[model samples]
Target: XHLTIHTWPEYGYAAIDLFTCGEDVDPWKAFEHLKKALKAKRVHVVEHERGRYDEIGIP
Candidate 1:
C-alpha cells in the first residue's frame, strides 16, 4: 500500500491518496509503501494565506 497527500487550492481540498499492491496488509506496511513511493520526493508543506498546507510528491 502507498499513501500520498495533496492539496487543491482552487477547491480548497486536502487529500490523502492511497495505493495498494495487495489485500490484507498491515497499516505499517501501507505506510512503508507510501514512504518508498515518496522517497524520491518527500512531502512538502506550503505556506498560504490561510496558513500551512501539504503537497505530496511532484507532478
Candidate 2:
C-alpha cells in the first residue's frame, strides 16, 4: 500500500497505488473498497503488464 499527496495554493493532488498477488484475490475489488473509503471524486487507472516498457526503459 502506498499513498502520496501534494498541494498548492489553489489546487491539490493525490495518488494511490495498490498491488495484489494471490491465487484467489481480485485487484479491482480491492480498488473499489478503497475508492469508497477515500470518497474520491475522480479515478484513473493505468495497468501494467510484463515487459511493457522494459526495452524502452523508464524516463
Candidate 3:
C-alpha cells in the first residue's frame, strides 16, 4: 500500500480552515481538545470575524 511504503503525501494529509468560516461551527472549542491530545505548545488559528465588540463599542 502507499502508506506502508512510507511515501510522502499519502497518509491522508489535509489542512482545512475551520476557524474563520461561516457559522454552525466552533473550531476554537474543538482545537482546545486537540491541543491536549496532540500535546502541542500552540497551533495557528485563523479568525477574522466577531471582533466588532472588542474592537469598537456599539454606537
Candidate 4:
C-alpha cells in the first residue's frame, strides 16, 4: 500500500491519496488511520475530483 499526503499551507487544506494492491486492504480504514495521524479536522474521499490521480492506475 502507498500513501501520499499533499499539504497546501496557503489554503489550509490537505489532499491525501491511498493506494493498495491487496484485496483485503480497506481504503476507508487506512484513511481513518491517516486522519488520526495527521490530526486533520475533516477528511474527504474525492475520487472523482479534478487533479486527482490513482497510484497505479488500476481503475
Task: Report lDDT per candidate.
Answer: 0.50, 0.60, 0.49, 0.71
Q: What tens digits encode model 3's per-residue C-alpha lDDT throughout 1-59?
A: 01111223564333434444446666676666656754555456565565466578765
**Model 3 lDDT at residue 18:** 40
Rank candidates, TM-score, best first. Answer: 4, 2, 3, 1
Task: Order the numbered candidates by lDDT, best leading.
Answer: 4, 2, 1, 3
Q: Tens digits of per-residue lDDT for model 4 on 1-59?
A: 56788999888788888776655866778888878887878666764333334654646
Cα displacement (angstroms), candidate 2, residue 32, comes to 0.3
- Model 2 lDDT per residue over 2-59, tens place: 3334434354344666555554756777678877876767879886453445567874
Between candidates 1 and 4, the one scoring higher on lDDT is 4
Error of 4 at 8 (Å): 1.5
C-alpha lDDT (0 to 100) for residue 49 of candidate 1: 26
What TM-score does model 1 achieve against the real structure? 0.28
Q: Give candidate 1's whole-model lDDT.
A: 0.50
List RMSD in Å for every model shown.
14.9, 6.3, 10.1, 6.4
Off by over 4 Å in 3: 1-16, 19-24, 48-59
Best by TM-score: 4
lDDT of 1 by residue, 1-59 (tens): 45577867686444554554433744456555655754535454332222123354344
